[PDB]
Amino acid sequence: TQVKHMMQVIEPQFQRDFISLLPKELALYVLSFLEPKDLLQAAQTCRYWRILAEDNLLWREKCKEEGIDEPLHIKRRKVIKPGFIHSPWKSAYIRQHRIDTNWRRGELKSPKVLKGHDDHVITCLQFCGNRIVSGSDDNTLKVWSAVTGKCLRTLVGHTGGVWSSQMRDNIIISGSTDRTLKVWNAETGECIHTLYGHTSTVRCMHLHEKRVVSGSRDATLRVWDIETGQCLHVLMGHVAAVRCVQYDGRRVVSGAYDFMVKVWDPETETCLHTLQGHTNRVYSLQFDGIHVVSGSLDTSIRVWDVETGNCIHTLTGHQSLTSGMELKDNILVSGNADSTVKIWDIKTGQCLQTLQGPNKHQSAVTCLQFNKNFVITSSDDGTVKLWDLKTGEFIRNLVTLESGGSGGVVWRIRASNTKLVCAVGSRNGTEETKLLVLDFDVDM
Amino acid sequence: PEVPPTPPGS
Amino acid sequence: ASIKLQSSDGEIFEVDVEIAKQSVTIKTMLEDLGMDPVPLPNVNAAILKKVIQWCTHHKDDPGGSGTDDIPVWDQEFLKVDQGTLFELILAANYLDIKGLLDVTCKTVANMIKAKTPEEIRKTFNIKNDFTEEEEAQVRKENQWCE
């Protein structure tokens, strides 16, 4: 009845064209075989076609195809001309398409600069809704607004450097060389719990629902209840430091400087599998419930089956340390000290792209994110680069530190659909430590 | 060649 | 076996039951309502010859669907003019013949992808009925890339 209202009321009578004259179901059926680019061009043909092409369900389907889940409702109205009844799904498509475009080629707006952690390293970074959490070897964490750039809180408590953190809207958890974890209220900044049990640095952690698992230089892992503050379980069997950990609520997976990856059932504190094969330290890890993926100093990345413990793929071709990997639906993106990023299909072992070329990173890759369109990579060269995940081609430098080749580095990044946040600094004073936040939203 | 920051040893 | 259809303009067609029953409309009127002959008030002899020709070609084409690539034979079969295509869409809908509807409709969609607004007019006729102001808005609201 959107279309009924608009036809009966704009009154576009006497057109001499094919689709104007069809029943409207059939005109819409025809229009359904078109891609959005075409629908937008059809819409500029005449009033009648415009009204048809603005059909709400036609665009709901187009949105589900790009995985756009909510419609978008605007307001500034106007009543500009005789009345138009916009489709929320259509403006949601268009929103997303302009956002994408803005990341690829939109003028780089000057980013907000959040100065903090003076003269120290930002060792972990978290970004959740409109909150950013930076953690540091100054012993603190700071909570910031991604919207205004203000520092909202400063989480003081640790007597030791912060090196790991997790966040889920308003719960933050930190891990330190002071051998503890801490649980914090982001809004108020109070430390609600302090978790004792480890005796050496809390190097990594992973949070799932109401439990975090921590891994430590002590060679153990502990599983902790976040509400109660109690340590539920203790996972013993590693022989050297645990550098990386994943937890899905059902199995813990840990990777350690003993070259080993272990899979555990936490409830019974038992190691179900020791995954052996890496010929050097394991540094990075991903896990999706079915596959474990482990990055080594071996320069290898191994893919394994949690259920059996069997190596499925040994993915090769990086030349140095794989420092971080992201895994999503059987696509894996790996960042390496060799300055290169690769994209892999972990079902087949295929290396789909290697990100390099004339605008390659000049030094180690420190961090990365990706979605179905882009990879974003950061580096000690002081840039953050945007690449096309489908073609593997460089698109552009999102950030280029002037001090990049004199000490400035990008330690890590987080991105939302709309925003990019970068932790930046230097070991020699050439770049003051800070976060950079860039906005790619569009007006809408 | 270069590895990321890591906590100091004991 | 064979059954009788009566076009809107009074002409009888002898058709193989299994080819005719591709029209859900016909099938229903045949099996559930027992019509003999089956009267088709919305389809004349001309398009009805074409519909039966299409069905006859696809009397085995086990749908299947395959909406993606439009077959070679069908593409030649609709090298036909705009008026006829329009009737074929209407007859496919009336007769409920999903394969014919899909093909014919895709064929029209293809006359749209991916021309500019102006080129879509020169194909479909269409007068630009927008004011200066309206066309500014529509161009702005339906901007691709920039």
Numbering used by the authors:
A (entry chain B): 2263 to 2706
B (entry chain C): 193 to 202
C (entry chain A): 1002 to 1037, 1044 to 1073, 1082 to 1161
Q: What did the publication describing this PDB structure actually write?
A:
DISC1 is a vital intracellular scaffold protein that orchestrates neural cell differentiation and signaling, hence the fine control of DISC1 stability/turnover is fundamental for the maintenance of brain function. Here, we demonstrate a novel mechanism for DISC1 turnover. This occurs through the ubiquitin-proteosome system (UPS) and involves a specific interaction between DISC1 and the E3 ubiquitin ligase, FBXW7, an F-box protein component of the cullin-RING ubiquitin E3 ligase superfamilies. The F-box proteins recruit specific substrates to the RING E3 core through their variable carboxy-terminal protein-interaction domains. As FBXW7 binds to PD motifs on substrates that contain the consensus ‘TPPxS’,22 we undertook sequence analysis of the DISC1 sequence and identified a candidate PD motif, 198TPPGS202.
The 7- and 15-residue core peptides of DISC1 phosphorylated at Thr198 and Ser202 (denoted DISC1197–203/pT198/pS202 and DISC1193–207/pT198/pS202) bind to Skp1-FBXW7 with dissociation constants (KD) of 17±2 μM and 1.0±0.2 μM, respectively. Thus, specific interaction of DISC1 with the Skp1-FBXW7 complex requires simultaneous phosphorylation at Thr198 and Ser202 within the DISC1 PD motif. As anticipated, residues 193–202 of the DISC1 peptide bind to the narrow face of the FBXW7 WD40 domain extending from blades 6/7 at one side of the surface, across the central channel, to blades 2/3 at the other side. The central five-residue segment (Pro196, Pro197, pThr198, Pro199 and Pro200) of DISC1 adopts a twisted U-shaped-backbone conformation to enable dipping of the pThr198 phosphate group into the β-propeller channel. Interestingly, residues 195–197 and 199–201 immediately preceding and following pThr198 form two left-handed polyproline type II helices. As a result, the peptide chain does not enter the beta-propeller channel and stays on top of the blades, thereby facilitating pThr198 recognition by FBXW7. The pThr198 phosphate group tucks into a positively charged pocket at the inner rim of the FBXW7 β-propeller channel and makes charge-stabilized hydrogen bonds with the guanidinium groups of Arg465, Arg479 and Arg505, as well as the hydroxyl group of Tyr519 from blades three and four. The side chain of pSer202 is oriented so as to allow its phosphate group to make hydrogen bonds with the hydroxyl group of Ser462, the backbone amide of Thr363 and the guanidinium groups of Arg441 and Arg479 on top of blades two and three. The pyrrolidine ring of Pro199 fits into a sandwich-like structure formed by the side chains of Trp425 and Arg479, while the backbone carbonyl groups of Pro199 and Pro200 hydrogen bond with the Arg479 side chain. Pro196 and Pro197 engage in van der Waals interactions with Val383, Val671 and Trp673 of WD40 repeats 1 and 8, whereas Pro193, Glu194 and Val195 interact with Leu559, Leu583, Ala599 and Ala626 of WD40 repeats 5, 6 and 7.
